[PDB]
Amino acid sequence: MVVEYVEEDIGPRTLYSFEPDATMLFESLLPRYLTTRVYAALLESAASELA
Amino acid sequence: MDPTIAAGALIGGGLIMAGGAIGAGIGDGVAGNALISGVARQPEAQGRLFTPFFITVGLVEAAYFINLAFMALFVFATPVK
């Protein structure tokens, strides 16, 4: 993935709390994100095939 | 003699104030640590955190000032002359 710094959108906003930390959640959530994207691709290709 | 009692009273009052100072100083420090951390997490939590914080301080400084009182009782109205 390419990383895309979007915006600031962080003023008096409250910081999140991560358990156990940030990177463990990130590295256990990334493959789930790729799987979600593959699922969306399969669904879109199915609807397209029916069209 | 009499001065021996006076000296004992001065040393005892000193010890009482020293204990009070250590207790109050470190207690307020360890409470303000949590206060600052909470205000660093959520700014608009400040007005809230001032309720438990000052409760804690109300306890901590209590032990201090009680000692202060007794220190006076040791130094000025020494029980045994």
CA distance A33 to B60: 51
C-alpha to C-alpha distance for B13 and B20, rounded to whole angstroms:
10
Q: Which residues does chain A have within 8 Å of residue B42's beta carbon, measured at their own beta carbons?
A: 14
Nearest CA in chain A to B42: A14
Calculate Rg over the CA atoms of chain A: 17
Angle between helices B46-75 and B2-41 (to 10 degrees): 180
Burial group, residue A6, by CB count within 10 angstroms (0-12, 13-18, 19+): exposed
CB–CB contact B43 A15 (8 Å): no
What are the DSSP calls for A32-51, one per residue?
A: HHHHHHHHHHHHHHHHHHH-
Alpha helices in chain B (DSSP H): 2-41, 46-75
Is A14 in the B-facing interface, judged by CB distances under 8 Å? yes
* Contacts A13 to B, Cβ<8 Å: none
Phi, psi of B74 (to 5 degrees): -75, -35
